Every structure is written in structure tokens, then in C-alpha cells.
RNA sequence: GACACCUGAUUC
DNA sequence: GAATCAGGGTC
């Protein structure tokens, strides 16, 4: 799966929940979502 | 299949997306809302 | 659907619904309650 | 079920 | 500020 963080410490797409969570855990109002394709993860990122 | 029943909020009723329901219950005192899988169940919550 | 343990409240004990638990702790000074997976854990909290 | 976070109620 | 509960991305 591809982890999209559109809002967090460090935005971008990540390949693991482990790295994804470092950006969003304890970060107020973090916006993230996992996807099956890189293309979708990136679309999410760019929607802000 | 996402139905958000707003029993207590800016506007009461059933909504199809969380963003919609959120705008009626966020920062609203004693807001009462719940998400259901079927429109029917959402109305019950709203009319009870 | 868990077990609501009320250590301090109008009536203490273990309740099965938030409503019943709520009726005992809401606006009760110094109310102490928590939900547990089992009844045993719950009655454990009631006696501390 | 758990974790994080948002909002609300109550209590301290 | 904190806790408990209620309603609403990830594991
Ligand atoms: Mg990565
Ligand atoms: Mg709508």
C-alpha cells in the first residue's frame, strides 16, 4: 500500500505505516490515507 | 452507503458525507450525530 | 458493547449501557468511571 | 479491539 | 491543563 500524508510533519507518499505514522501521530488534525497505487497516494497529497 | 444522522446540530437530518455532517456538529454544544449504513436507520436516529 | 464500571457516582456497580452509566456520573462531583472488556475487570475498578 | 487526532458533554 | 465517556485516519 502507499501511504499518503497530505498534512503532517513531513508530507509525501511513504511505503510503510511505520514511516507514515512518524508524520501524523500526535500531530493535530493530520490528514493521511493509504492507497493501492502510487498515483492515488500522490493525487491525495496534491489535493492540498 | 454512508448516512450521517444529525439529531442535534446546526441542521438536523441525514447527510451523505462526513464533511457535510461535520459542518453541522463541529463546535456545536451537545451535538448529537451518528453514522449509519442505511438511510432508514439514519432517519430513526433523527426522528426518535 | 463493554462493561461500564462506576466507582463513584449516584449508584455504583457495573452497567451495560452508556445511558445507565451516564445517569450515574453526569454532573456528579468527583465521579469515577471507566469501560472494561469484562465484568471482572469492571468490578475490579469499582472496588479500588 | 487498539492507536492517533477532531469535536462535544461532564468532572477535577 | 487532565481524566472519563459520547460521535467522527491507521493497526
Ligand atoms: Mg517511505
Ligand atoms: Mg448532504
CATH fold descriptor of chain A: Ribonuclease HI, Chain A
User: For this structure, what is the CATH class of chain A?
Assistant: Alpha Beta
Instruction: Encode the helix/strand succession of chain A as letters.
Output: EEHEH
Q: For the largest beta sheet of chain A, what order do the strands appear in spatially?
A: 2-1-3
Overall SS class of chain A: alpha+beta
From the coordinates shown, what is the CATH architecture of chain A?
3-Layer(aba) Sandwich
> What's the main sheet of chain A like?
3 strands, antiparallel
CATH superfamily of chain A: Ribonuclease H1, N-terminal domain
Task: Report what the structure shows.
Three copies of one chain form a homotrimer. Chain A is α+β, with helices and mostly antiparallel strands and 48 residues long. Chain A has one domain: Ribonuclease H1, N-terminal domain (Ribonuclease HI, Chain A), CATH 3.40.970.10. In chain A, 35% of the residues lie in helices and 29% in strands. Chain A is built from two helices and three strands; from the N terminus they run E-E-H-E-H. Chain A has a three-stranded antiparallel sheet, with helices on both faces. In chain A, a hairpin with a 4-residue loop joins strand 1 and strand 2. The radius of gyration of chain A is 9 Å and the shape is globular. The complex binds magnesium ion (2 copies). The site of one magnesium ion (MG) has 4 residues of chain A, from loops. Chain C binds a DNA/RNA duplex (12 and 11 nucleotides) through helix 1 and strand 3. Chain A: Monomer. Chain A: Belongs to the RNase H family. Chain A: It is found in: Cytoplasm.
Amino acid at each position: 500500500m502507499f501511504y499518503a500524508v497530505r498534512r503532517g510533519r513531513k508530507t509525501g507518499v511513504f511505503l510503510t505505516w511505520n514511516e507514515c505514522r512518524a508524520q501524523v501521530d500526535r500531530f493535530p488534525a493530520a490528514r493521511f490515507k493509504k492507497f493501492a497505487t502510487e498515483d492515488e497516494a500522490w493525487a491525495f497529497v496534491r489535493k492540498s
